[PDB]
Design an enzyme around this catalytic site. Structure first.
Site, PDB file in Angstrom:
ATOM      1  N   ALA A  62      -4.105   0.496   2.080  1.00  0.00           N
ATOM      2  CA  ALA A  62      -3.694  -0.907   1.956  1.00  0.00           C
ATOM      3  C   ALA A  62      -4.017  -1.488   0.575  1.00  0.00           C
ATOM      4  O   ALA A  62      -3.190  -2.190  -0.024  1.00  0.00           O
ATOM      5  CB  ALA A  62      -4.362  -1.758   3.051  1.00  0.00           C
ATOM      6  N   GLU A  63      -5.236  -1.268   0.068  1.00  0.00           N
ATOM      7  CA  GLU A  63      -5.564  -1.880  -1.220  1.00  0.00           C
ATOM      8  C   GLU A  63      -4.807  -1.210  -2.368  1.00  0.00           C
ATOM      9  O   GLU A  63      -4.396  -1.884  -3.322  1.00  0.00           O
ATOM     10  CB  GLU A  63      -7.075  -1.847  -1.478  1.00  0.00           C
ATOM     11  CG  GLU A  63      -7.931  -2.557  -0.412  1.00  0.00           C
ATOM     12  CD  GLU A  63      -7.786  -4.083  -0.402  1.00  0.00           C
ATOM     13  OE1 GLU A  63      -6.888  -4.621  -1.095  1.00  0.00           O
ATOM     14  OE2 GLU A  63      -8.574  -4.749   0.324  1.00  0.00           O
ATOM     15  N   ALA A  64      -4.594   0.112  -2.292  1.00  0.00           N
ATOM     16  CA  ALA A  64      -3.758   0.787  -3.286  1.00  0.00           C
ATOM     17  C   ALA A  64      -2.305   0.327  -3.215  1.00  0.00           C
ATOM     18  O   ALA A  64      -1.631   0.256  -4.247  1.00  0.00           O
ATOM     19  CB  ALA A  64      -3.836   2.307  -3.099  1.00  0.00           C
TER      20      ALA A  64
END
Ligand code: P1U
Ligand code: P1U
Ligand code: CL
Ligand code: CL
Ligand code: CL
Ligand code: CL
Ligand code: CL
EC number: 3.2.2.22
Length: 238
Positions: free
Chosen positions: A164-166
């Site tokens: 998700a953060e990538a």
């Protein structure tokens, strides 16, 4: 709707993340160079989600982990063990209903605040490698029950960062993907990476107005290329 994030190689990881971004978001007109853009998540009804199948942790094994992601905000609602067909769902995502799977309503919420407490692991300085993603995979496959454990919480913190953060942040995609090379170095999440994730909402609100540097809290972009180098996908809030 199901997508694969393939950790086999640096190129499979980046292209599988890009394939997801192209399906769920639309490029901003004013922040694009070549084929690279900041994209805004396409609007979907509340409760919409997609699945991410984790593949290629061993360059065909370790293939029974699936993440459930709320589409409008990219928060991870929980994880699916596809070997047991069980969805372990965070307590603040009871509106996410996956048919055909046994749903376990956990007592633990999805917040980084909660997960870092249970994991006894701060994200600032947290290290992620191919090896620790395999270890994290095994922790999640062994997890059963209603309350998150230390090992499962550490596993979620690692996997949320590289999925998700990538997806949100090209900066995190770029610093972690090196860990998938045959040299197998270790990714260390920096205070700056953490600051990015803590500022995603306001970054999402500022970038649609950007025309032709910009600063949000401790994050400073001096030009378009710095924005593109850092941010890939933003919320639809304007
Ligand atoms: O789900 C979130 O975290 C979320 C949704 C909208 C926002 C947000 C935060 C700050 C500003 Cl200024 C504008 C929008 O954050
Ligand atoms: O995975 C990566 O490292 C990646 C993919 C695309 C980019 C990028 C970097 C800077 C600009 Cl200006 C535009 C695109 O980086
Ligand atoms: Cl793009
Ligand atoms: Cl396996
Ligand atoms: Cl919270
Ligand atoms: Cl932290
Ligand atoms: Cl290489």
């Amino acid at each position: 709707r199901e997508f694969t994030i393939d950790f086999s190689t640096q190129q499979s990881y980046v292209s599988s993340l890009n394939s997801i971004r192209t399906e769920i978001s639309t490029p901003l007109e004013h922040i694009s160079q070549g084929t690279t853009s900041v994209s805004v998540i396409n609007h979907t009804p509340p409760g919409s989600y997609f699945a991410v199948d984790i593949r290629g942790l061993d360059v065909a094994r370790f293939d029974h982990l699936r993440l459930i992601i709320e589409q409008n905000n990219l928060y991870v609602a929980g994880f699916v063990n596809t070997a047991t067909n069980t969805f372990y769902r965070f307590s603040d995502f009871t509106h996410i209903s996956v048919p055909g799977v046994t749903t376990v309503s956990m007592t633990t919420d999805s917040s980084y605040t909660t997960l870092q407490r249970v994991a006894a692991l701060e994200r600032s300085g947290m290290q992620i490698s191919r090896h620790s993603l395999v270890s994290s995979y095994l922790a999640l496959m062994e997890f059963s029950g209603n309350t998150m454990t230390r090992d499962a919480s550490r596993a979620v913190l690692r996997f949320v960062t590289v999925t998700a953060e990538a997806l949100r942040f090209r900066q995190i995609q770029r610093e972690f993907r090196q860990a998938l090379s045959e040299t197998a170095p270790v990714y260390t999440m920096t205070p700056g990476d953490v600051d990015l994730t803590l500022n995603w909402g306001r970054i999402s609100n500022v970038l649609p107005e950007y025309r032709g540097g910009v600063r949000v809290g401790r994050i400073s972009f001096n030009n378009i290329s710095a924005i593109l180098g850092t941010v890939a996908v933003i919320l639809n809030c304007h």
